[model samples]
Target: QPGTSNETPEETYQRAMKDPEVAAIMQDPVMQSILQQAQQNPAALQEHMKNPEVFKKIQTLIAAGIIRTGR
Candidate 1:
């Protein structure tokens, strides 16, 4: 396993924001709007997820532990 250990979502996001690539991704207009839309409507979130580019970004965030998927 990797050297890194567990951390809270708040901790992860805070650290991720300091990361250059993650910070840039977070600032992207497309990424920002979709996240807002994700909260506004589930259907709209699904629609954007169909986009390959959007999905890729989502996957990156998920892997980076910045986006928690399951309950």
Candidate 2:
């Protein structure tokens, strides 16, 4: 019998962020700016919050309740 693997979607996403292929795709200026803005702005935070998949996973977390306030 084969052993089962145990890894969460968040873990997989984190790993994908470091993947060479995914990193290459993320190197685009638009993608870089989106990542930067999301790090710096409440509006960008809200925009990603509208993503159903990410929202569903993170909405219950402690940090998710706070607004970014661009600070």
Per-residue C-alpha lDDT of model 2 across residues 1-71, encoded as one tens digit per residue: 12353434355455556555555444444434545777687478566557774453334231322212334
Each prediction's RMSD over C-alphas, in Å, is 4.0, 9.9
List lDDT for all candidates, in order. 0.74, 0.46
Q: What is the TM-score of each candidate against the true structure?
A: 0.64, 0.31
Worst 10 residues of 2 by lDDT: 60-69
List candidate 1 segments past 4 Å from native. Answer: 1-7, 14-23
TM-score of 2: 0.31
Model 1, residue 51: what's the lDDT? 89
Q: Write the per-residue lDDT of candidate 1 for residues 1-71, one digit (tens) a residue.
A: 23464655667887777777787677777877887887888777677778897887776677678977665
